[PDB]
């Protein structure tokens, strides 16, 4: 009958339906939205992972498509050239999607790191502003605040060495705190 033509039709329809789904996630993952929070940067990650689960839930569907193309190819379908070409395209589209998801995840990780660094600069800065106003328990609470300013310094140097997207502002905020600290350290 039109068996072989109908199979080609099915193959191509499945192909395009998969291609459109990839398009949607592709745009979804193209987002440039970053949080201005730590709770927000965390929710952004929670959502990116849900997208990870949605991408992986399609694994079986994609293999059924590969299997379908394998059968058409194995039986020498007259459109084998065109069929194989679609496989190459889908393989590439799937690969780029995985890489796009990974890239966005990296950005969301760096967003969280930057937001955790900022809240550290604030815990130590809101504290230095307090001591700058009125200016033996003093002692223990000085060793305490110095431990925090040391973590805030190693943490900032870790991100800068990891190639953070905010190298310029991470190093700037730190150099600003380390100097505003050694100034209050001298007057105390």
Query: Residue ranges of the domains in the chain?
Result: 1-105, 108-187
- Cβ atoms of 104 and 165 within 8 Å: the answer is no
DSSP states along 50-92: HHHHHHHTTHHHHHHHHHHHHHHHHTT-TTHHHHHHHHHHHHH
- Cβ atoms of 126 and 88 within 8 Å: the answer is no
Task: Give the resolution in Å.
Answer: 2.3
* Residue 63 exposure: Cα atoms within 13 Å on the Cβ side: 5
Scanning the structure block, which residue is given the tokens 């929710």? 43
* Dihedral pair phi/psi, residue 162, rounded to 5°: -95, 0
What contacts 90, CB < 8 A, 6 or more positions away?
Answer: 15, 18, 19, 62, 65
DSSP states along 89-118: HHHHHHHHHHHHHHHHHHHHHHHHHHHHHH
CATH code for residues 1-105: 1.20.58.60
CATH code for residues 108-187: 1.20.58.60
Are both 1-105 and 108-187 of the same fold?
yes
Task: Output the CA–CA distances (angstroms, integers) from residue 136 to 58, 94, 126, 144, in the order listed.
Answer: 64, 64, 22, 13
Distance from C-alpha of 42 to C-alpha of 150, rounded to nearest angstrom: 25
């Amino acid at each position: 009958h039109s068996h072989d033509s109908h199979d080609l039709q099915r193959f191509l329809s499945d192909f395009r339906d998969l291609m459109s789904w990839i398009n949607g996630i592709r745009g979804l993952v193209s987002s440039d939205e970053l949080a201005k929070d730590v709770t927000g940067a965390e929710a952004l990650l929670e959502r990116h992972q849900e997208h990870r689960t949605e991408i992986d839930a399609r694994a079986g569907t994609f293999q059924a498509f590969e299997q379908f193309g394998q059968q058409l190819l194995a039986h020498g379908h007259y459109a084998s050239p065109e069929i194989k070409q679609k496989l190459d395209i889908l393989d590439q589209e799937r690969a780029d999607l995985e890489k796009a998801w990974v890239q966005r995840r990296m950005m969301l990780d760096q967003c969280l790191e930057l937001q955790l660094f900022h809240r550290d600069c604030e815990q130590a800065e809101n504290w230095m502003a307090a001591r700058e106003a009125f200016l033996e328990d003093f002692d223990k609470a000085i060793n305490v605040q110095e431990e925090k300013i040391a973590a805030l310094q190693a943490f900032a140097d870790q991100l800068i060495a990891a190639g953070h997207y905010a190298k310029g502002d991470i190093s700037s905020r730190r150099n600003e705190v380390l100097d505003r600290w050694r100034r209050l350290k001298a007057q105390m």
